[PDB]
Amino acid sequence: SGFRKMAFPSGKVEGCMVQVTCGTTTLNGLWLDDVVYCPRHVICTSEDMLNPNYEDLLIRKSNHNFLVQAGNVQLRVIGHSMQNCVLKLKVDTANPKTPKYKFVRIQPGQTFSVLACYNGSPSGVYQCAMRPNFTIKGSFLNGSCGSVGFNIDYDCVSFCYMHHMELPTGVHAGTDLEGNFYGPFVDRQTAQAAGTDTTITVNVLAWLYAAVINGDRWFLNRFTTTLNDFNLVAMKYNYEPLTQDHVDILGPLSAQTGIAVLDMCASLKELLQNGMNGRTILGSALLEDEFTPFDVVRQCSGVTF
Amino acid sequence: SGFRKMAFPSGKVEGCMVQVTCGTTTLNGLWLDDVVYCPRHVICTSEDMLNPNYEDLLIRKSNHNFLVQAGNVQLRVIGHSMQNCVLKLKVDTANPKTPKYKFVRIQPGQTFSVLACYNGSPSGVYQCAMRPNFTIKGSFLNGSCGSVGFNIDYDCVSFCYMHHMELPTGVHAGTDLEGNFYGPFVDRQTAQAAGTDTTITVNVLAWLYAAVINGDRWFLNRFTTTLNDFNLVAMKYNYEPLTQDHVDILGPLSAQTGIAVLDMCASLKELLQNGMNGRTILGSALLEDEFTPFDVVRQCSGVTF
């Protein structure tokens, strides 16, 4: 029993984290097989970050300008190329601790674990959601660039995020492992607007199923409602609209608790209109949206790695 | 910037987790050097758990009644002894992945990371506090017994918790690694009363400093107060009393933010009496007490392992 913001065990990712230095810029890299992946702005001075020309900065650089450390082990760079916002450094040594992995681009609402690192060394692990405006509400300091986000399916590590920037509003922006930014962001220090954030409705519903599973049932009401009626209300409160895809994904939780999705929808409807009245659900006085339906199943059924 | 419930990286603990079977009871063990540590009730049937005589049950058992698996690999038990509520199984093989470690008994209010395991296999990691009544509010299912809690102090793993049972009220109880229970609990399936829980005042103050560091300053008021005056209020709301030791521990945060401890105390005083009035601090609508002063410093200054 109980319910926590649970992260994946980080061990398989810890053995991939390295330190990358170019000139006086140091940040984190990911060592898989004989390639080290890192943010391309490693080739920038702090000055360059205002208006960087990544082309002309990169031409002025050779293989030996790049220092790669895995612990006290020096890796030798024998090749370098820029793929969108990521640098790939080919090194002389394949990482003997390379796990089974894949590169995935996640969708808004999906969750992942972040291994926050400084100078190639792990500091902490926490679970995050990709917000609908493509930011993450992380915990990152100077030198955390190159930290990664991941999911584990069985023995396979799915890398979905590399950390690049803090925006002037103190939220976080980065790329997939192919170096394409999530959202409309660029790797330049200039004012950048994230769009309005919205609540990930399907995740809030997943969390209400989790509450019922854990004995918190007070919010369960007499009423029902329709998708269309539910969605009119959701859009007033800055909730994401609910699709047939969301209803299909909540099927297993529906079947476990004996509560039809639309019934859970009516319950949520009342909470938006009337609030929680200074009651709590699973020890929180707000509606939580950083658990997927898969996270709830994983935690309440005991899935291992 | 930002602030998250951050757990320690779990890799050094992941390589110590094994599966221990005795008859048809299977749970988690910790393999350090040539000893496997596990809850002693592994020798119990479900039936035995109501009123176990551990001496008598252990006498009926020989070394070969104990199956130890690390992944695919069967380890051979060549010795067994009971130390309080823990079984120590001597095995033919020292764990090659034994980290630098210590056994510590922690105090109420201290935090640690839990590596939740099933069948010797890591499922997830989360941070929590030892409550003042010596329970933890965990997330554990059947088969989680023998899961451990730990702190990392540079290269050294401090094991402080082994999970044993869920109480009828859905909170968690266990031992230190010498097998002494935290709190008045016994390893028996019988109704057991946890004390009244209290809010860990020094941790709430640490979290308010974290809020100020992160730009949440609305709660900062004109007023001051004395310890004695502050404590009369705290005891009415089920807060732990604040001692000179707590004030001394908050000194560095006080010095960093330029806000005197007693000033922060007056600010907390108002929030207890007037509540938060819709507003949130660091995304929460309740006062958080599962960050120590050291947790805040670690996260806001960027300490690695």
Ligand SMILES: *[C@@](O)(C(=O)NCc1ccccn1)[C@H](Cc1ccccc1)NC(=O)[C@H]1CCC(=O)N1Cc1ccccc1
């Ligand atoms: C970086 O890309 C990174 O850490 N970004 C993520 C981040 C930053 C702040 C808060 C949260 N997340 C760069 C790389 C780098 C490192 C060293 C020298 C130059 C560039 N690291 C930074 O810390 C950058 C970005 C913000 C910043 O002030 N900065 C330069 C810096 C670094 C250290 C001390 C002062 C200034």
Ligand SMILES: *[C@@](O)(C(=O)NCc1ccccn1)[C@H](Cc1ccccc1)NC(=O)[C@H]1CCC(=O)N1Cc1ccccc1
């Ligand atoms: C183990 O002590 C354990 O998992 N305890 C912690 C915990 C935390 C949250 C929820 C439940 N338990 C025991 C050990 C065990 C395992 C298998 C067979 C016998 C004993 N595991 C349990 O799951 C205990 C506690 C609840 C339960 O059902 N149970 C005994 C049991 C299990 C299965 C069938 C009958 C009885």
